[PDB]
Structure formats: C-alpha cells, structure tokens
Assembly symmetry: none
Amino acid sequence: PSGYGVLLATHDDDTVDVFTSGRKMRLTCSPNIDAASLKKGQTVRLNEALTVVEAGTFEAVGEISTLREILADGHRALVVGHADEERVVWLADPLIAEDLPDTRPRKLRPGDSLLVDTKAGYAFERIPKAEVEDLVLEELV
Amino acid sequence: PSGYGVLLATHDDDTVDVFTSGRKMRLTCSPNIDAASLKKGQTVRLNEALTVVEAGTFEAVGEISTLREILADGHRALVVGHADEERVVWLADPLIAEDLPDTRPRKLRPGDSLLVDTKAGYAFERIPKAEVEDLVLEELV
Amino acid sequence: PSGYGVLLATHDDDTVDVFTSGRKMRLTCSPNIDAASLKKGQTVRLNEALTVVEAGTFEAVGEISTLREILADGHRALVVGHADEERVVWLADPLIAEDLPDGTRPRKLRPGDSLLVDTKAGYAFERIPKAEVEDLVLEELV
Amino acid sequence: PSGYGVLLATHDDDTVDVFTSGRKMRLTCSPNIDAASLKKGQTVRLNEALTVVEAGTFEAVGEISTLREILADGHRALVVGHADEERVVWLADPLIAPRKLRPGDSLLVDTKAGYAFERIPKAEVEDLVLEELV
Amino acid sequence: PSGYGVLLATHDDDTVDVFTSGRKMRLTCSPNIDAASLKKGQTVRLNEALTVVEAGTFEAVGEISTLREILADGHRALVVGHADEERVVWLADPLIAEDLPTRPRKLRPGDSLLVDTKAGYAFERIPKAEVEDLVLEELV
Amino acid sequence: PSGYGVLLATHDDDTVDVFTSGRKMRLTCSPNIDAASLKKGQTVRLNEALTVVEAGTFEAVGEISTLREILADGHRALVVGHADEERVVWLADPLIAEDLPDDTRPRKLRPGDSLLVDTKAGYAFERIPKAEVEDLVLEELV
Amino acid sequence: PSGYGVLLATHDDDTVDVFTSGRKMRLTCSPNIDAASLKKGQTVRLNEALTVVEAGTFEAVGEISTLREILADGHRALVVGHADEERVVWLADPLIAEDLPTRPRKLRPGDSLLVDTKAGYAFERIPKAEVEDLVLEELV
Amino acid sequence: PSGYGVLLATHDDDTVDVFTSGRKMRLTCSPNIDAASLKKGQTVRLNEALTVVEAGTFEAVGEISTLREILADGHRALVVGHADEERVVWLADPLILRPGDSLLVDTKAGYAFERIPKAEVEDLVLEELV
Amino acid sequence: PSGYGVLLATHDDDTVDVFTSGRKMRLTCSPNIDAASLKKGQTVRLNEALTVVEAGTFEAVGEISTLREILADGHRALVVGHADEERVVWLADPLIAEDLPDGLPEALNDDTRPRKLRPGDSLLVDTKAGYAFERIPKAEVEDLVLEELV
Amino acid sequence: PSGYGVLLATHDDDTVDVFTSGRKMRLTCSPNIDAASLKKGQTVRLNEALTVVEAGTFEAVGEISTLREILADGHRALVVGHADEERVVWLADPLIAEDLPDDTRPRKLRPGDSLLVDTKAGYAFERIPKAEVEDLVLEELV
Amino acid sequence: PSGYGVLLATHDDDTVDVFTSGRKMRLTCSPNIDAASLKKGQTVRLNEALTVVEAGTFEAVGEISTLREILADGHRALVVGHADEERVVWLADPLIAEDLPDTRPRKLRPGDSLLVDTKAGYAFERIPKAEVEDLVLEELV
Amino acid sequence: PSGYGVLLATHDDDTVDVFTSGRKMRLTCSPNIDAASLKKGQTVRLNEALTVVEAGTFEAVGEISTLREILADGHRALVVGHADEERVVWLADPLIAEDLPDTRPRKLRPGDSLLVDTKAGYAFERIPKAEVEDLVLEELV
C-alpha cells in the first residue's frame, strides 16, 4: 500500500515538505527522484516508510474558490470561497508558468475559478466556467 | 472483517487508486479482481492488508449537488451544492458511457441532480426530481 | 466492552454490511443470529473482533430531515435538511412495510413528513409527527 | 486516568449502554456500582479498560436548543437549535422525573449523545437591557 | 513533552477533573500540586502519564461570545455566539471573585467573553472599542 | 519524518510551548537551538520524539480575518472572521516589531487590516494587502 | 350626475359630516333623508350642490388590513396593512353591533377588515381560507 | 367629446353607478340604452352631460394581481398585489377562477376583469434563447 | 357646505394658520371664535369663504408612527413610520400639557391613561398637516395572540 | 396652447379614442388627420377644445419594463416592472408589424426584452437594447 | 385668505421665484417687502393675487433625510432618504452661514439628518438625534 | 405671476414643446425668445396665457439616478433609480456638447450620477460623488 501527499516545497538539502495524512511533514525522496525537478503543488506517492518514491500530476478534483488577487510575491493568491471566506493559498507551478498567454491555459485574472485544497493550502488548476445562457439552453433543448 | 473504498483510478499494473479511511491510497488487487471489468467510481472491498478483494456496485446514498457543467475532459463535472459551494468531481463510468442517449438513463445535462461523495471526489448517479406541485398535492390530499 | 453499528444490508453468505466506527464494513454474524430476518436500518451489537452478536432495534434520537420523495426503487428517499441540504438516505424496513395503511400512528410516508435520520450511516428510521404551531403556541401561553 | 461517558440504558446482565469517545458502547460495571440506581443521561466515570466505576450527576454546560414538543412516548423531545436545525433527543431523568416542560423552553442539550438535561430559564430582554445600560 | 488541560473540578483524593485532548478526564496530581488552591478554569500542565504537574494561568486566546445573563447558581453563564448559537458555560473563578467592584468589574449582560466551547468555560472579559474610534484610526 | 508546529512561548528553562498535532504542548529544544532567539508565532520543526529540532519562518498560507482592534496588552488582537465570528489571537512578533513605521510594505497594524490567522493555534502572522476592487475588475475585464 | 361620500357624523341641526372628494365636509341633508337612521360609515349620495340626497349601504370593495386590536373606546381599531403600515380607523356601525355573536361575529385580533384609509373607516370582516385549503384548490 | 367609465352596478330606476374621472358617480342612461342589459364591469361611453350613451367591452390593460379566493357571495374576490397588498374587488360579469390565478384588475374602480394565462417560464426562457 | 382644517398656529390679529385642502393657509376667524380657547392641532371648520367658523376636537383616525424623541424646543417630535421613514411633526397641545403625570408603575400592567410621552410611544399623526394628536396604547402581542387562538 | 395624448383606437366617424389628461376620451379629428394612416400607440396633438389636430411619432422617454410574454391575441403583453409589478399593456403597432425579422436592429419581440412603457396609457412603444454590463464597466473604469 | 410659499430666488426687478401650490412661480412683492433681504429657503406669505406680502421663518416640520455631501458650489446637498432614494436639494441660508462653528447649531457634516421638503427641493434645518441607548433607558426606566 | 416649464423640443414655426403643470404642451414663443439660442432641457418661463416669455438655465435640484448607458441615438440615456427602476430620459444639450473632453465638465460615462426629472423625462447635470471613505472621515474628524 502507498499513500499520497502534495509537495509543498523542496529544500536545498534535498528533503521536501509534503502535505499528507492531514499535516505537513519533512520527508526524503528515494534515489529514483530528482527533488529539484519536482513541481510546487505536485502530487507525490509515498511508501509505507513515508519516502517519496514517485511524483505524479496535480489534484484534479475538490473545492473551487474565486481568485481575488495574486500577492506581491507572485507565488500566493488571495481566494474567496463559497460563503465569502477568504484564504491565502500557494499557486501550483503550472498556474504561474512564465510561458502562459495573457478554456485554453492563460495567465490568471481576478475572478478566475481555482481548484483549491484548503488543508494543503494550494491552488492547482483554473476551471473555466461556461456562460449560464449556454448551459440553460443545453438544459432546456 | 472487510473495509470498503471508492475506486478512483486503475493503473497498467494491477494496482488501483482507492479512497478509503478518508484518504487516497494506491492498493494492490487480488486475483479475484478482473481489472478489465473495473469501473471508475466503483465501490471496492478491502481485506485487512488493504488488498482489493472484490469489486462492487456504486455508492447509493449521500449528498446531492446540482450539475453546472461537464468539464472539457468529459470525465469531471462542476457541481454546486446546498449553500452554493462549488466543487469539481469525477464522473463515475456509467454516467458518461458512450451508449447513453441524449426517469431513465441518459446523458447528463446542466441542472441535473447528482449523488456525490465530496471526500472521494466522485458523482455516482443522476437523481430525478418530481415536480413540487405533484409532491405538494401528494402531501395535502 | 462492545460497540454498535447500523445494519446496511445482508448478503447471500451471512456476512452483513454494517456502518460502525464512522465507516462501512462487511462483518460476520455469529451462528446465534438468524441473519435472514435482520431488518435494514437495525442496530446490531458487535464484539471486540467485529462479529455481529446481537440484533437490537433502531436509532431513536438524531437529526430530523423533511421527506421530499421516495425514489423509484421504493427503498431510498430524497430528504431536505435544516439548511436546504438535500441527501439520498435508505429507508429502514419498518418505514416501507407493505402492510402500512396510508392516511400520529404508523402509516405510509408522504412528502413533507419529518424523518429521524443518520446522515453518516445514510438511513432514515422513523417518522416524527409535528404538532400544529398554534396548538404549541397555545400551550406555551396557557 | 479515567474518562467519562453519558449513561444511555441499563441491561439485566450487569452491563450499561454508554456514549463515550464519540460512540455508543456496551460497558460492564464494577462491583461498587449500584446498577439499579443508575439514571438515564447520568454522567458515569470509566476506567482504562472502559469499565463503569462511578456514577456522577448530569452535564451542566453545553449547547442550548429550544423545545418544540415532547414526543408521544414522553421520553423524547423534538428540539430546534440555532440554525433552525431540528433534532430528537432523550430526556434525562430530571426532565421526566419540578415543572412540566412547555414549548418554547430552553434546554441544555448534548447532540452527540442525544440527550437533554436541564431547563435553562431566560430573563426578559428588557431587564437584561436595563442591567447593561443603567 | 508535556500537554495541557483546563481544570474543571477538584476531588479530595489528589485527583482533579481536567478537559484535555478533547475530553473530560479525572487525573492524578503530583505532590507538587496544591489542588485545593487551584482555580476553576485554570490551565494545568500534564506529563506523559497524564498526571497534573503544574498550574498555569488561563486560556488567553480563542472565540468570543456575548454574555446574555449569569445563571441563578452564579457560576454558569448563558452566552450567545456569532451565529446566534446559545450555550451555557462555567465562569472561570476570577470572573466571579467577590473582590470585583475599562478594567476589572462584575459582569453585565452584553459583555464579550473569551470562551472555550469544547471545555465549556469563559475566562476573560474582552473590552471592545467604539467602532467610530476604530474607523477614525483606520482612515487617518 | 519530521512534523511542524507553531511556537507560542519560550520559558526560562529553555523548553517552549508549541501548537502541534491540534494541541498545545511544552516541548524541549535541541541544544543547537538558541531558544531565547525564537520569535512568538515562529514555525518550528519537531522530530518524532517531539523535540524541537529547527526554527523556521512563519505560516504563509491559510485563513484571512479582519483586524478589529489590538488589545490593551499590545500582544493580542480581536479579529473578525468571514461569518462575523469574533476571536482573540496572539500577534506573531513581526506584526508588532517596535521598528515598524505607520501600503504593500511593512507597517504597524490598523483596524480593518486583513491578517493571515491560524485559529487553532490562535495566532496571526502576516498583514495581507488588498488591492482596490476597481483595479482588479479592470484587470479581469482588460 | 350625483357623487358619493362616507357618513362620518350627524349633528343636532340635521347637517352631517361626510368624507367626499378626498376631504371632510359638513353638509346639509335633503328633506328626503331620515337623519336619525343614518349609520356611521354608511355611504351617502350627494347632488351637484353637495346636499346629501340618499343614504346607501357600506363600501364593499377596497383595501384589506389586519385587526391588531380594538381601542379602549370600542369604536376605533388599530389595523396593520400590507407593509406593516399601522393605522387607526373608526368601526362602521355593523362591525360593533351589540347583538353580535364565515358568518357574522365579534372581531378578534388577526381578523381581516375591509378599510378605506382616506375616510378612516373599517366596514366589513373578510374571512380568509387556510392556505392548504387554497393550495389544494389551486393544485387540483 | 366623450369620456368613459366602468359600469359598477345598475339601479331599478334605470340609473347606473359608474366609476369615471377617478370617482363613483350615479349616472343616467340615454333612451338607446337598456340599463338592465348592461354588464358589471363593462366599459361605458359618456357624453358631455355624463349620460351613458354607449356600452362596450371590458378594460383590457392594467395591473395584474393574484387571486387568493372568491368571497362567499360569489361576486367579490380577495386579490394580492405585487407588494403583497391585499384588496377586495368586484368580479366583472365574465368572471362571476382558482386560487393563484392572475387577474387584470383596476384597483381604483375596484374591479377584476379578465384572467390572464401565464406560460411556463422554461418555455419563455427557451424562446428568449433559441 | 363647510370644510375643515387643522389649526397650526394662532395669532393676535384674529387670524390663524390652518392646514386645509392640502396646504397651509392664513385664515381669518369669525368673532364667534374664542382665541383663548384654541389649541394647536385642533380641527376647525371653515365656511365657503375660508373663514374659521368653529373650533372642534382633534383628528382621531389616521396613520400611526413611533416616537423617537421630542426635540429640544419641546413642541416637535421626531417620529418613525412603517418603512422606517423619519419625520418631524408638531405635538398637539394636550400631548405636552404641563400637568401630565409620569404614568402608573408598570407593575400595574396598565398604560391607557394620559401621561408624558416617552420614546417608543405610538402616536396618531397627520403627515400632510405635520401634527401628532394622540398617544395610542398597544396591547402586548401575547395577549392578542391569546385572544386570537382561544 | 396644445396638449397631447396617446392614440388608442380609430372609428369610421372621424373620432378616435385617446388617452390624455390621465383619462380615456373619444375625440373628434380635424380633417388634417389621415385616420387611415394612424397607428395604435401614436402620439396625437390636441387643441384647447380637445379636437385632434395633428398625429406624431411615439413616446420616446419613460419607464422601462421587461417583457414576460405576448398574450394570445398578439396585441397585448404581460410586462414586469422594477419591483416585480406585473401589468398587461397594448403593443404599439410598429412593435408587432408582420415584416419584422427574427441587438440594436429592429426585430420580433422575445421574452426578456426591455420595453419603454407608459403604464397610465397602458402601452409599450419601443424595444430598448441593453449593452453588456462588462462593456459598460470597462467604459466606466477606463 | 393668504397662502404660503418657499422663497427660491430674488430678481433685480424685485420679483421673486417662490415654490407654492406645488409649482415654481415668479411672483411680485408688495412695496413693504425688501426683496433683496429675503433668504433662500425662507417662508413667504402670499395674498390672493399671489403677491408676496410678508417674510417668515423656515419650514419646521416634514421629512427627514441624511446628508451625504455638500456639492462643490456650497449651496446644494446630496441627501439620502428613507428608502435610499438620493436627491439634490438647495440648502436654506442659515444652514450654510459662514460664521457657524464646526444639539447646538454648527457646520453640516456627512451623516447629519436634515429636515427637507423634496417638492420645493430645499433642506431647512439640522435635526439632532439622541443616542438610542439614552432613548431606550428613557423608554425602560 | 408667471410659471415655469422644461423645454422639451423646438419646432421650425417658433413654437416649442414644454413640460409644465405635469404635462407636455405645445406653446407659442414671444419675441423676447431667441429661438436660435434655446437648449433642450432648459427652464422656460411662461405667462398666464401659457406663452413662453423668457428662457432660463436648467433644473438644479431633484432626483438622482445612475447612468447605465447612452442610447444609440446619442440623445437619450437609460438610467437606473433608487429601487432599480429603469427609465429612458432625454439628455439636456450641455450634457452632450460636442466640445466635451474625457468636478469639471466631461463626456458622460456609465456609473455617473445624473440629476433627473422623471415627469419631464430629462437629465440635466452630472453630479459628482465623493468616495465614501472621505465622507466618513469628514463626519468623524
């Protein structure tokens, strides 16, 4: 049996901070893994000893919140959840890639919907929203 | 005793991603399992070593949310729950089977009520809803 | 010491699905239990090894939700909770007993009925009658 | 160290149902315990092995809900909490066994164990306002 | 490593009731502890065995609720929280000291109290500034 | 593996109070920690024995609440959460640095500031600037 | 062409106070009128000269307000309208007839009254069906 | 020039009550008019002397209110306006209806004239969007 | 035919201010009018020439508003109406009589007799004329509910 | 001085029904009036004797209401006003002309359209196009 | 009989604009009126011919609105009524006298309650409001 | 005495449409009137026979609504009032003067607050609004 976590950060000593089992843990990576090529926000698989033995993609299901703004450091966002609760979260590396254009991937804007994991403290993906007129037609026709 | 889980994903190695005991795990399948017959969203039975020993049906009780839209990938849905909380969930395999036509089974449309499990991140079943006046008539008569 | 669970379903083999310790488990009965006659929704007692050793009655206290409708299969209901949260629950066997009269005393269920429910185990157990607010208000005043 | 639980029911076998650690459990009592004299809803103390070793009074602090009505059986009550959440609870010994309860009464409840314990009187808002303002 | 708890009640056999790790426990005190000088609501320190080994002050951070009224027994209060959820709590000893005549006084309806709703305790009256003064301070 | 916690207070016997695993604990530091050099609210790393093995920065993600007022002691603040829940929290040492002036750059707190808070640990860590909504909407619409 | 008004009072000189054309007036009555038998709240017909020439019944259509309570004097009521507007109105003679017991009876708080808020009168109790009875009739 | 009114009721002397120019008036009819054949709620045309000289149909535009219930007499209805304002109106001749029905009313004249059907909103939204 | 108005103010030239036909008018009085018996807020009757011919009682029906406070001059009140509309009105003379008592202790649960006004009192008002005329006592809602339901 | 009214109907006797001075009247036309070419809802000019002396265009300012539906007869519409007040109004001739195509362009009416109405006269005159709020706010902010 | 009006402006021919009988009118003044010493917002009395024959004080009863701001010209104000209706009104002359200090007369500030006549388009008087807690005491004592 | 009205439109015959006494009328203009210089929305003065005898400026007090958009014709505006009541009004000529740039005069933008007379169906003036926080400071300082 393997468990999973979210990669929060890598350290120059090659250990990593991982969110797993409901908490933040400093863990090591098996020799199969180049800790320096891991991506912030990335899903990692953990063996029974909590060694990181494989890096995967990103959380793809969960809570959606609305981006208010990206903070001055470029790596955190202030997000607004369903009952107006505001939170700060880290932006997973793919959200802030320098080569995004400003339904296709693009640079984030205020009002964008973000898939977030509030316990790990991360945003992973921009979720496009179709126009309500288009959805309703599709419901009604 | 046996435990249970939701099958999240299958892998090309006779292991599977399962959500059980409130967490996502990569588990081995027993010889009883015909990993060709396995359906995303399916209930699985786990023995005490956390081996998947049997494939079951689908969760049939739990929370209802409203479908807003199926994501571009065709395997995930944006649903809106009781307090306008929005979430992305995976669609169980029968909800999206190609042979569904567009009461009884059909392709999903915006506005449909879906039985969901928000911890596991899955919708399982479309729940039809009677017209309120029919129900109120049934109450009052 | 012993724990308890809610009987979710019985199988071909005298094992049962039980909701206990916050989760769904397939458990064995002891030979002393006619597993055939166990009722869906029923409280069962478990020993320390999780064997089901005794059959009880039904959860009697808990959250109330309003019945919207019984689903097509006749064994599940869509219920609406206190903040308009909607859920599908299984109906305990007594609730859907074919020998119930329709139309205070036991009767068939209708939309608008208040049901005692356990949303973790995912069951409704009992219809809870409600007095008219004016009779209650009257009793509060006189 | 010992823990605590709420007494739910007794059995003619020397065991009691107790709500403890967030769950209903069937527990044995110690020889010191007068099972006969135990009260519904009573606090009991439990040892490490989870034996009931002492009977206490009743929960005295906790959430408040409003009594809508006592059910027909006279042992349960339909109560309405703060977000209009409705629930059925057992009435502890002191609430069935001293003025009868009336709709509108405020009751001290434990919604996990499913018990009401005590009627809590409420001052008139205007008397409280004078006490705040004078 | 040591843990902590809120003192609920004292017994005459060198044990006390303490709310710790989410639940009410009856725990032994070390010889160090003068148990009948403890105060209701007081923080206690627990060793690995759950023996009480030191007395501290009082919870100083947490949820705030509004006092509705002190109950007839004079030791419990009816308080109302953010979403109008009502609760009965015990008053920590110094909130009801016979000493009491801003700064320290007897409690009145409408006072804001620091509470721990899991332990069932109020610890402190938290004064509130006038919103007009705060807004001035925000805008100037 | 090592876990983490929030530094609540230091004592003069060089143990520290730390919030970790959902509760307040008194913990010993490794001799390699300069314990009077620790700051209130600081993140610390803990080994499995629960010794403090390293001192860090401060929580940087989490819930936001609005500052109502700093209490008389200068070390706690009354904050107001998303559904008007009110709480008292400690202020992490950087929030209250005596060399702090009175934007998007560090300054002393004012009522109505947004603060990153951890309501379980009962601490505030960082002032979070908010842009003007009309600027944000323009960036959304442009 | 004749107009109409609401009878407000009769005087000793057989003139009458009438609410007509949006205002209160003191008017003479025709030899045709039995000024004694006119009833307060009663409709009267007025000729172009504004002489009262005929007595009628009572307004039968109009706004409906909820009785809060009959005032101390027994001839006025405090009524509550659609957006909680509260008014005092006079009770037309038939509403407080001393022989009173969906059929005539004495007024209770909560009753719906047909009112003319300009003239300041209530005229008629209007029975209301229970909503479930009406919803049933709507539904079927 | 002529004016118009709403026929409110007829009298056995062949005169009528008409709501015209914002008020209730008792008017006479011309010899051409059979007053006994006029219908409650009917529009009448008036000459300069305020004689009823011609009968018409019924008001066709106006405020809509929701029927709560018809009164026991069968001639009046209790209706609820948009801001939950309740009133009693007379029923025009064609209406003398189920609770919840939408009715064209003239609250000054105190009459309901016509039941107004409403399409299902989902049929309307489709027609907005297709 | 005679009309009516509300007496707003008296003067010593045999004229009064009156609110009538929707507006404030300065009207002469018949010598039958005793200027030392006129009370601000009272109803007066006017002849066809708009001479004040008789002086009467007070408006007894109309809109109710809640007293917030009597203003510093002692003669006007700030009142609050149904949709939270706030207005200033003159107080009719009897509402502010020097000899009005405080009122029975509430332990007597009776508030029907005339007393000095207090914030929260219900006042009968005419917002066109700008006058309050009478304090309207209100029963407790529980008694009214009792009378409705028993 | 002349006043004005809204044309309601024509008759074959050189008179027309007109809504003027807050009421419906039957008025004679001067021979200048080409009654054949009058359109329901049209403005007309009246002399001091209330003779119709000239015919105009249509009211061009006033209240806006939302079209719910055209009634069965095709000449009246149920409209919903600002506070959800519902009314039936007549449709001015041009709004229902048979040569309307199915924006800023002239077309057949649809539920959801904003109509200029005169609720006294009981007419709708004109469909008023609405810009998208995003475009307006952009215009506001830049 | 005499009527009354609100003085709006004076002209150099000693005629005046007056709001009376629900309309703005231009009226002449009797020889005894010093039209140049009239104040904006002042009550004037009018004979049957609609000549201004006496100047008075200011309207003392009516609708209360809340001052939002004084406009740039210093002579008009934007006020907010009971249903959040906004309007601009003229300020009667005493409201804006230069010698007013900044219960007792003073310079106007946002949030002040003004006695207004919305038909005439004028604000006349600042109405002080007691603290609700002092009024409650007075009510409860 | 004279009355006043709002100039709605001018004709080539030296007559004008004017809103006065709560209605639209077509009146005759006297020789004191330079038709060349008359502005849509302007206040005019009327004698007792209802001749226009003088041209004034513009209504300066009254209701305020928010501009939603200027209609395609460029002379009419869709405005939204205190209870979100929407209306069409004409814009007085100075509001749309061709020399207007982008407190001081400029072209209108959505969101601007306009002084309106909903009976006459005209907007007259852009009324600036201060930021609430500046107003609250002024209230408290």
